[PDB]
Amino acid sequence: KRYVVGISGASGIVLAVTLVSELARLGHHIDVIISPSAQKTLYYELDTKSFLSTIPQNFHNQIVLHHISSIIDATIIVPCSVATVAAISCGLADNLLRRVADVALKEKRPLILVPREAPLSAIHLENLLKLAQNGAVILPPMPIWYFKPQTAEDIANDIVGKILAILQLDSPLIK
Amino acid sequence: MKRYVVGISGASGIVLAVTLVSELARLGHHIDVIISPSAQKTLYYELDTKSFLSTIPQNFHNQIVLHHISSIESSVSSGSNTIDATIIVPCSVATVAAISCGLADNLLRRVADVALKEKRPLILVPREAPLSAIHLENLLKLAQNGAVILPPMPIWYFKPQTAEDIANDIVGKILAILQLDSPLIKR
Amino acid sequence: MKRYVVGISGASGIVLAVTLVSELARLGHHIDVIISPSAQKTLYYELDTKSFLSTIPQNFHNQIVLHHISSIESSVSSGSNTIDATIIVPCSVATVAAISCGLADNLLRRVADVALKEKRPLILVPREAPLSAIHLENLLKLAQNGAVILPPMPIWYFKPQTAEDIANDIVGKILAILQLDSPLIKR
Amino acid sequence: MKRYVVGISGASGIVLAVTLVSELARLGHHIDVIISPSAQKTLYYELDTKSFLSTIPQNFHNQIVLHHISSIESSVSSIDATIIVPCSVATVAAISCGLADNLLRRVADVALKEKRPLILVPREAPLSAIHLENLLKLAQNGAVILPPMPIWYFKPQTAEDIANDIVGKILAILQLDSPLIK
Amino acid sequence: MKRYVVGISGASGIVLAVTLVSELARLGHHIDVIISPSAQKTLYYELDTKSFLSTIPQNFHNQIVLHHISSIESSVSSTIDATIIVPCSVATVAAISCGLADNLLRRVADVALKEKRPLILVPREAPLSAIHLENLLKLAQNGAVILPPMPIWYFKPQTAEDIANDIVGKILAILQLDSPLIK
Amino acid sequence: MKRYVVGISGASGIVLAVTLVSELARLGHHIDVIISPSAQKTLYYELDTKSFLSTIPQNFHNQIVLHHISSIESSVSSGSNTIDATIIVPCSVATVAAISCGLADNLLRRVADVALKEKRPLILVPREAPLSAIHLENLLKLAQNGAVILPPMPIWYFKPQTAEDIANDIVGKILAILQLDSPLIKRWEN
Amino acid sequence: MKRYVVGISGASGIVLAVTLVSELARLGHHIDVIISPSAQKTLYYELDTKSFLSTIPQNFHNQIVLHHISSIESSVSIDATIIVPCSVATVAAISCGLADNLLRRVADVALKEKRPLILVPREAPLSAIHLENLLKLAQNGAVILPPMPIWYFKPQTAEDIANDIVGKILAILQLDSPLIKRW
Amino acid sequence: MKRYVVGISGASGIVLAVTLVSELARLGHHIDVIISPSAQKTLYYELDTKSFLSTIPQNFHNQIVLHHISSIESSVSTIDATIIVPCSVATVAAISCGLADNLLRRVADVALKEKRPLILVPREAPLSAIHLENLLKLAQNGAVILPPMPIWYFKPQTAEDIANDIVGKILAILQLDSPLIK
Amino acid sequence: MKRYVVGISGASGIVLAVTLVSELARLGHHIDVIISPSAQKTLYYELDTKSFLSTIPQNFHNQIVLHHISSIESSVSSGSNTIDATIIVPCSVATVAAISCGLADNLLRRVADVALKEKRPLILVPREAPLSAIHLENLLKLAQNGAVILPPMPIWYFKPQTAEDIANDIVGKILAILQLDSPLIKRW
Ligand SMILES: Cc1cc2nc3c(=O)[nH]c(=O)nc-3n(C[C@H](O)[C@H](O)[C@H](O)COP(=O)(O)O)c2cc1C
Ligand SMILES: Cc1cc2nc3c(=O)[nH]c(=O)nc-3n(C[C@H](O)[C@H](O)[C@H](O)COP(=O)(O)O)c2cc1C
Ligand SMILES: Cc1cc2nc3c(=O)[nH]c(=O)nc-3n(C[C@H](O)[C@H](O)[C@H](O)COP(=O)(O)O)c2cc1C
Ligand SMILES: Cc1cc2nc3c(=O)[nH]c(=O)nc-3n(C[C@H](O)[C@H](O)[C@H](O)COP(=O)(O)O)c2cc1C
Ligand SMILES: Cc1cc2nc3c(=O)[nH]c(=O)nc-3n(C[C@H](O)[C@H](O)[C@H](O)COP(=O)(O)O)c2cc1C
Ligand SMILES: Cc1cc2nc3c(=O)[nH]c(=O)nc-3n(C[C@H](O)[C@H](O)[C@H](O)COP(=O)(O)O)c2cc1C
Ligand SMILES: Cc1cc2nc3c(=O)[nH]c(=O)nc-3n(C[C@H](O)[C@H](O)[C@H](O)COP(=O)(O)O)c2cc1C
Ligand SMILES: Cc1cc2nc3c(=O)[nH]c(=O)nc-3n(C[C@H](O)[C@H](O)[C@H](O)COP(=O)(O)O)c2cc1C
Ligand SMILES: Cc1cc2nc3c(=O)[nH]c(=O)nc-3n(C[C@H](O)[C@H](O)[C@H](O)COP(=O)(O)O)c2cc1C
Ligand SMILES: CC(C)=CCOP(=O)(O)O
Ligand SMILES: CC(C)=CCOP(=O)(O)O
Ligand SMILES: CC(C)=CCOP(=O)(O)O
Ligand SMILES: CC(C)=CCOP(=O)(O)O
Ligand SMILES: CC(C)=CCOP(=O)(O)O
Ligand SMILES: CC(C)=CCOP(=O)(O)O
Ligand SMILES: CC(C)=CCOP(=O)(O)O
Ligand SMILES: CC(C)=CCOP(=O)(O)O
Ligand SMILES: CC(C)=CCOP(=O)(O)O
């Protein structure tokens, strides 16, 4: 299958690494788009400058990195900053990340957004609501807890487990 | 002494309420706690106890008063008693819905409606995923009415190692909202 | 002889329900009374009794039928049984909220919804202060749906002396909008 | 096999829920049933029984699970379709608000948040502006609004005919073939 | 002696109009009846007849005036005690909610709203889409009574006719008439 | 010393304004007072005087400035002069309508607009019954712009005996919103 | 005998209010009348008098009580309230709840007590601002009755057009009067 | 010769009305002027005069007609443009509501209903949500909303420079050629 | 010592930013300043320099920190800093639009978004005339979300003489809104 994973500048790029690596482990193809703002979040959070170093080498044939300034079963924006939520909710399809979101909305194909921000102001909630009403799946990264997590790693994997469930996949990360 | 009301609603993540009440008590404040019946069940399934007090040090119990969910006559049900902040943590979408409608027909819901009517701080920790359009509209209306919408989102730029680290950082953010200094707050 | 439904909701001023139901019987009418459990507490805290019937002169009791708040199977829960006017007094913001949402899941909320859908008179006596934007949106919506919104506003140009004068003159307005003539009415 | 959730709410017409659950059972599907206490009163006033199961052929009972209205901790609270039949306007209101504070209301909320089929069979007359606003909000969020209305161009003769054709319409929305569909 | 306007629109359930008009005449009132061409078809598919008046006993015909759907010049087009559109298609619901009073059936509904006289609509459609619920909402907010034909199972009907009879009884209760159809 | 503005508009219950300004002065504060022409009439019908100042102990007059309703050039008509709170009591639905529309065309309405635009406290004590949908919508709009909507609702759980009791306890709730410490404030217990 | 409140606001057509008042009194009813300052101006410009009562037969004057526009403490602060003619500024104030003179206040009391309020707004063109206020007032129960000539009554004179319009006010008041014509 | 209506509302900045009217007259146009009671007070506090005409060169008086604020009968109640300057938020409120109950509010209401140009120069700070809502409504009905913002890219040196270039912006909206415009 | 964020957007009136920042520094406060590329040009056209700091007395520079518009990783870019207030002066209409939409994709937009979500003071000084319906709606939306909308309206009742007088008195009103006691503030 073919999945578009866009990585927006919000905190939690470990969610994106985990999704892509597991997607790739399931024999699927992934098109990844990294915003410059997430390219930095990548170094501050996983002390590394290449997103591809975080992925098992054997999966690299199944992954295509795209430049956000260039002029399909589902699209996932993870993490998704509020600025990217705003752009998508406005129709402001003026980079590749925003535009692949817009295409998903325009064709009624699955669009999963993973917004990290807290608190959420009325401005951001109104954009999320608009996107929900237009068919986007709004999936904030909420720890599941009744799975008795122990590590930070447990929490991330169960959050990604929720993503894969929505993608109608099966994976040992779903609980 | 500041005086806080903590409402515990039956969403996943009751550990967040335990550490928030623990830290508020440690810092020396008074905490009125209301646990819903569904939260009572979340406590057993997540923390393996049926007594909320059993999760907080006994030396702090003098700073904590539990009110039954049906005691709408309790002192914290009236706006004539000054509370410095009200926190609903965790907060189910059902309780978000009730508070957004004004449906103050139990003490947990009433305490939130009192905070809004007196324009005192109300912090909601809604936990649910996905968030549907119905739930997002309730959250929006609550934010426009002055509630702080603080979903329990992990702060990964602090690089937690343990689950407890994530819980502590998230409670840190609540205490920052409360403008309390606490070592759970990171920067 | 007319038939009236009086819902007693748990806001302050249950004395208003008492004097309205008393005057309605004193003029010959039938009153179906629904007392919420919270209004029962208020009756105690404000009138020092646990029997609403014990507040009404005894020869009026045969004109009054108490209904349990869970009895949604009751005749007054159906729109085919003809009621002249329905009064929720006092009315909490919680019950205002419920009625404005359509949340007719107990007999008190149900009789108000039934009055709305049959376009029969529904008088709400909401008592709360201050009134938040949430409360005022619910009130607005109910007035647009034909409900008469009558907060218990003391009438100071009648120059009241006692707390009882203020109560009497407030019930005088309820009776006026019902279109009864009563010595409680002042002009 | 397929798995259905039938919430029975306290409006008139519980005969509809019986023949729905009975026919789904007959086709070999599993049904999770949730009865509100108001529905339990209506079961007695309209069908003169205090047992919902005394209604379904005894051989089907191993395909039916009854869940207490208060069990929001339960299995279905975390899948082929969810039917609330009949549906009171109070439960319409609760679902339209997202007020998922009992099990019947929560299974419906779960269906909406997961984009799974939700069929509501609201029964009330007149429908006021308050009820219509809640119904509109649910339609806009993808619930199928199916008031139980006699079909008549099938020329029914019995009351039972009228209920059967109404349930056939439900069965047709679930895209199951059934003799009840015309 | 009251005066009713009954508009019959092409939604399934024309037996309801027949029963309503019959009982109103049996109770001694006058009824102006307007039948749309689609209701004309439904009358044939559902009651096997081409004449509405043949469904009504002959001694009530003096109390019933048929108007053609194009007669926006009619007396009823300009005091009536109540106006009932039964059954009412969602297309006619839409027209009335828009104010599109461009035939006599739609016009008598608009007159009732404009004069703030009772207007009872008996819409029959299932499922009801958001577009149709919005029109229904708008009409309720403008004071139309929205009375879909919901069967009343707690009167324990045995036959189809019982179900139709009890639904017309609710219409009659909304009209504040005493009829034995009301339970 | 804090600085308050009390506008007195022509609804019933001007005893509330008398009681509030008297207590503000007792606590040691300063009050700029504005009486509408309709409130002046209401003073006469409810308290049987044509002088509001006659209702307050002379002890306190040095702490009170009466402003005429048309003096939109007054010091309290500007936002450069910091006011701690502004209270319209009682408040007619007509003045509610004015303030909710932004129709600041007299000093009492202006003083409320100034509080709203400077995000300083504005307490409205609207008295009217029934409240139509027109009045509710204006009150809603004002609540959403940050006005405290505090109708003069009697507090019966304080078991009042006289009319004076009911008014004092109502003024007590106003002083509680002002976050002042006053013996007029009472508090729920059990 | 019924009691009516007739507010005269400063829009064109003050003859309409003259005619309505004369006939209401000629039917044996009481009329409380409130004239705005601008209506007194238009009274002069349109009927060549500054005395409203100079236009009304003297035998009717004991059924008529004039009220000053600023008398907001008035006993009238029942049956029906007619603002005729109604200027768009008065429409604006009433729709806002700006009840700060006696004319505006009696209209607000009518709406709050859900008693008949009939507005006869005269202005043309009607902008979006005025139409929004009119919609709000109609949604809150007010009858919106612009003075639309009834040409199917084939009037001859200006007096005829005015009479027939007042006949429509009378019809809505549910009175019987030789001014009302039916079609 | 064109005909303008200038309403002078009681906000700060009456200097703008003075230099607008006297420049219109210098171009040889007709100006009907309406001064609210409040604007008479701010004329005094800002221009230490009690006479509006005393601020305009006496030569131009024959092209200016003063109308009393209460004179709602009046011809001005064919006009090329109507300018309320300065414009208080109270007057913005009245106009946005259609509250045309004095001549100043009324000439603005007439511009809007006839779709003739209406320029409002509102002056208040902060602008609350109540003020913004009225201004938005006015802009949706075609009013030009022109708050008196200094034009700093013209490097003003004195207060009069700032006032002059603000009036220049008004004259540019009126489509007039004037030295005030750059 | 309070901490202010002053964002400088490319509209006319950068002199307001200059005199706000130096008076806040003079009172002893700390100021993080963000200058957009467009405001840097306005600085030259209106103040005849491209060094913002050359318009500020050198004794105040230790209290000022200049952040680049593209550093969305900055410390002012988090709610973890308790900034006492954020001021966007002057504020272009494009910047008003971005903030009202939540389009927080540079540091100046982000700092305004943070103040909104933390419920800390955000003062906007929009300069545009005329204001279209589209711009009034954005303004309205921000005022409903708590932003103070403070256009630079000359205060003529203080009878200013010079152009500096008008700018000084306007900055006085900003400082009043900041609840600072400052000799630039005049009272009526
Ligand atoms: C370490 C770091 C963490 C961040 N976390 C968030 C976040 O959790 N939520 C958010 O809305 N923005 C966050 N941001 C800022 C966003 O990256 C910023 O709004 C950016 O413009 C988003 O643009 P983008 O969506 O194209 O990446 C963070 C920035 C950094 C440097
Ligand atoms: C003594 C007393 C007085 C109360 N007064 C009010 C009141 O004035 N307004 C209000 O909204 N709630 C008031 N409450 C709380 C309500 O009773 C509470 O919200 C309750 O759940 C309402 O439920 P009900 O409307 O079903 O009676 C009061 C409670 C008590 C014990
Ligand atoms: C015999 C009977 C029939 C009822 N029929 C209806 C109905 O048709 N529509 C409705 O809204 N309520 C009806 N009710 C009332 C509802 O049951 C009541 O509002 C209830 O609280 C709804 O709760 P539930 O939806 O959880 O079952 C009926 C009650 C009884 C006893
Ligand atoms: C273990 C467990 C976890 C739950 N987590 C959530 C949750 O995260 N969000 C939610 O909306 N409901 C959750 N629920 C269901 C709610 O408890 C249910 O909606 C309940 O009626 C909420 O009422 P309350 O908030 O007053 O406790 C959970 C239930 C259980 C048993
Ligand atoms: C036998 C029959 C039954 C129909 N039933 C319905 C119905 O129940 N609801 C509906 O919306 N349309 C129904 N229609 C279609 C309507 O006739 C169609 O919308 C028509 O144009 C309505 O016109 P009218 O309302 O002016 O009569 C039916 C058509 C036929 C032939
Ligand atoms: C004795 C008396 C009592 C009044 N009470 C009220 C009242 O309770 N509520 C109200 O809205 N108006 C009341 N009014 C009328 C208002 O004063 C009237 O609408 C007035 O124009 C409001 O003007 P103001 O708010 O500027 O004072 C009363 C008038 C009088 C004479
Ligand atoms: C010196 C002075 C300056 C004023 N400046 C303003 C102002 O800038 N903005 C404003 O809205 N009101 C201002 N006002 C007050 C208004 O004049 C007041 O709200 C008045 O009622 C408006 O009436 P008008 O707009 O019809 O003239 C000022 C008043 C004075 C005395
Ligand atoms: C002769 C004359 C005719 C008028 N006709 C109208 C009119 O038809 N419509 C209108 O809105 N105003 C008309 N006006 C002006 C209004 O009287 C004006 O807006 C006034 O402020 C409204 O005041 P009032 O409605 O409280 O009486 C007219 C004025 C005069 C002198
Ligand atoms: C010399 C000059 C002056 C400008 N003045 C304004 C102005 O006063 N108001 C405005 O909205 N835009 C003005 N602009 C245009 C905005 O700066 C432009 O929309 C910009 O891209 C917005 O980005 P920024 O506000 O973040 O700097 C001006 C541009 C230049 C070159
Ligand atoms: C428990 C109690 C007395 C509630 C009533 O107080 P409030 O004025 O509604 O805050
Ligand atoms: C007891 C009960 C559920 C009554 C319902 O009656 P109706 O819906 O008002 O016709
Ligand atoms: C009963 C239970 C586990 C509820 C929580 O599930 P969900 O995340 O709300 O779908
Ligand atoms: C058919 C006809 C004369 C319609 C006009 O009457 P009305 O004045 O619109 O009620
Ligand atoms: C009376 C007066 C100077 C009002 C204007 O002050 P501000 O615009 O509210 O600061
Ligand atoms: C002048 C007067 C008695 C006004 C009364 O208004 P309300 O209807 O008693 O609130
Ligand atoms: C003074 C006068 C002619 C007012 C009426 O003007 P218009 O017909 O409302 O434009
Ligand atoms: C620059 C950065 C770490 C932004 C994230 O902070 P926040 O928790 O979204 O306020
Ligand atoms: C490019 C430039 C000088 C823009 C200034 O014009 P405006 O005030 O933004 O309309």
Listed resolution, Å: 2.3
Which one of C132, C138, C141 makes the best mutation probe of the B interface by having the most chain B beta carbons within 10 Å?
C132
Which residue in chain E is spatially nearest to D158 when comparing CA positions?
Answer: E159
Q: Residue F173 CA: which ligand is closest?
A: 10
The H-or-E segment that residue H92 falls in is: helix H89-97
| Chain-chain contact of H144 with I152 (C-beta, under 8 angstroms) | no
Residue B38 in contact with residue F151, Cβ under 8 Å? no
Return the half-sphere exposure (C-beta side, CA atoms, 13 A cut-off) of residue I159: 7
CA distance E85 to chain G (A): 23
10 Å Cβ neighbour count for G46?
Answer: 15
The DSSP-derived string for B54-78 is GGS-GGGGGGEEEE-TT-TTSGGGS
Cα separation values, G28 from A67, C40, D72, G63, G117, Å: 87, 53, 69, 8, 21
Copy the structure tokens of residue H181: 């415009």
The closest of H77, H70, H12 to H39, measured between CA atoms, is H12
- Using a threshold of 3 CB pairs under 8 A, tell whether chains H and D touch: no
Q: After which residues is chain H broken (C to N over 2.5 A)?
A: 77
Ligand 10 centroid to residue F190 C-alpha, Å: 11
Interface C:G, Cβ pairs < 8 A: 3
DSSP single-letter state for residue E171: H
Element (H, E) at B124: strand B122-126
Distance from CA of E96 to the nearest CA of C (A): 20
Half-sphere exposure of I51 (CA within 13 A, CB side): 7
Query: Residue A81 C-alpha to ligand 17 middle, in angstroms?
Result: 10
CB contact under 8 A, B41 and D106: no
Structural contact between residues F134 and C140, judged by C-beta atoms closer than 8 angstroms: no
Answer yes or no: are the C-beta atoms of C126 and B126 closer than 8 Å.
no
User: What are the beta bridge partners of residue I66?
Assistant: I33
Peptide bond into A79 cis (omega under 30): yes
Q: What's the start-to-end Cα distance of chain A, in Å?
A: 22
Q: Is F80 in the pocket of ligand 14 (CB under 6 A)?
A: yes
Task: Provide the residue type at I23 as one letter.
Answer: E
Among all chains, which residue has been given the structure tokens 């009228």?
A: D162
Backbone angles phi, psi at C114, to 5 degrees: -65, -45
Q: Is I131 exposed, middle or buried (0-12, 13-18, 19+ CB in 10 A)?
A: buried
SS3 of G34-57: EECHHHHHHHHHHHCCCCCHHHCC
CB E78 near ligand 13, within 6 Å: yes
- Contact predicate C66/C35, CB 8 Å: yes
G39 Cα nearest atom in ligand 8: 27
Residues of chain H found within 8 Å of residue G93, distances taken between Cβ atoms: 99, 101
Nearest ligand (C-alpha, residue D103): 4
Q: Which residues of chain B lie closer than 8 angstroms to D106, CB-CB?
A: 94
The distance of I144 to chain F (nearest Cα, Å) reads 8
In chain F, which residues touch H (CB < 8 A)?
A: 72-73, 100-105, 109-110, 113, 116-118, 141, 145
State how far Cα G33 lies from the chain centre: 9
Count CB neighbours of B111 within 10 A.
26
CB of I137 within 8 A of CB of I101? no
Residues of C in contact with B117 (CB under 8 A): 128, 130-132, 135
Distance (Å) from the C-alpha of residue B157 to the closest C-alpha of chain F?
36
Of D73, D96, D106, the CB nearest to B41: D73
- Would the CA dihedral through A114, A116, A118, A123 be positive or negative? negative
Q: Please indicate whether residue E73, judged by its CB atom, sits closer than 6 Å to ligand 13.
A: yes
Are H105 and G92 in contact by the 8 Å Cβ rule? The answer is no
Tokens of H63: 């092209």
- Which residue's entry shows tokens 């319906």? I133
Quote the CA–CA distance of A84 and A113 in Å, as a whole number: 10
**Helices assigned H by DSSP within chain F:** 14-26, 37-47, 93-101, 107-118, 133-144, 163-177
Dist. CA F11–CA G100, nearest whole Å: 11
H30 Cα distance to chain centroid: 14
A13-25 and A152-166 helices, crossing angle to 10°? 60
Ligand 4 atom closest to Cα of B90?
8
Count Cβ atoms below 10 Å from residue E60 Cβ, excluding itself.
18
Look up residue F13 and give its amino acid. G
Q: Which residues of chain I make contact with F79, given a CB cutoff of 8 A? A: 176
Where do we find the tokens 């750059």?
Answer: H182
Q: What angle do CA B159, B165, B167 make, to 5 degrees?
A: 125
> By C-alpha distance, which of D160, F39, I70, E27 is closest to A36?
I70
Q: Take residue G172 and report the two structure tokens written for it.
A: 């809505």
Q: Which helix (H) or strand (E) holds D14?
A: helix D14-26
Q: Which SS3 state, helix, strand or coil, does residue H144 take?
A: strand
The two tokens of residue D166 are: 């109404």
Mutation target vs G (from H99, H114, H130, H140; most G CBs, 10 A cutoff): H99
C116, closest residue in chain D (CA to CA): D128
Tokens in use for C66?
């108490």
CA distance E51 to E38: 14
CA distances (Å), origin I99, targets A92, A128, G120, I92, I107? 14, 16, 46, 11, 11
Phi then psi for residue C125, to 5 deg, are -115, 75
Q: Residue E160 gets which letter from DSSP?
A: H
Contact H93, H136 (CB under 8 A): no
Q: What is the residue with the minimal CA distance to atom 13 of ligand 9?
A: I11
E112 is in an annotated binding site: no
Chain E residue with CA closest to G145: the answer is E114
B95 lines ligand 4 (CB under 6 A): yes
Burial code (b: 16+ CB inside 10 Å, e: under 16) for F142-160 equals bbbbbbbbbbbbbbbbbeb
- Is E91 marked as binding a ligand? yes
Evaluate: CB of H40 within 6 angstroms of ligand 7: no
**Cα dihedral I170/I172/I177/I181 (nearest 10):** 180
Q: Which residue reads 């609207």 in tokens?
A: F126
Asked whether the bond before H86 is cis by omega within 30 degrees of 0, the reply is: yes
Rounded CA separation C89/I144 (Å): 35
Closest CA to A143 of D106, B128, B161, B168: B128
Q: Which residues of D touch E15 (CB under 8 A)?
A: 152
- Closest residue by CA, ligand 16 atom 1: H73
Q: How many residues does the structure list for chain E?
A: 183
Which of C95, D34, D72 is closest to B37 using CA atoms?
A: D72
Q: Is the dihedral of CA C17, C22, C27, C29 positive or negative?
A: positive
Q: Nearest residue on chain F to B73, judged by CA atoms?
A: F190
The contacts of residue C187 (CB under 8 Å, 6+ apart) are: none
Query: Angle C14-26/C163-178 helices, nearest 10 degrees?
Result: 60
Asked if the peptide bond before residue B90 counts as cis, ω within 30 degrees of 0, the response is yes
CA–CA distance, A159 with A171 (Å, rounded to integer)? 13
Q: After which residues is chain D broken (C to N over 2.5 A)?
A: 78
Nearest CA to B161 out of A155, A56, A15, A55 is that of A155
Determine the residue among I3, I74, I78, I80 to mutate to test chain B binding: the one whose Cβ has the most chain B Cβ atoms within 10 Å.
I80
Query: CB of C106 closer than 6 A to ligand 2?
Result: no
In sequence order, the 6+-apart residues with CB closer than 8 A to the CB of F66 are: F33, F34, F35, F52, F53
Write out the H or E segment, with its range, that includes residue D6. strand D3-8
3-state secondary structure G72-100: CCCCCCCCEEEEEEECHHHHHHHHHCCCC
Check CB contact under 8 Å for I186 and F119.
Answer: no
The DSSP secondary-structure symbol of C183 reads T
Tell me, using a 6 A CB cutoff, whether residue I95 lines ligand 9: yes
Asked if omega into G155 is within 30° of 0 (cis), the reply is no
Q: Is B127 within any annotated ligand binding site?
A: yes
Question: ∠E143-E147-E148 over CA atoms, to 5°?
Answer: 140
| Rounded Cα–Cα distance for residues I138 and I144 (Å) | 10
Element (H, E) at H182: none
Q: What is the dihedral of CA C30, C36, C37, C38, to 10 degrees?
A: -120
How many CB atoms sit inside 10 A of residue G174's CB? 9
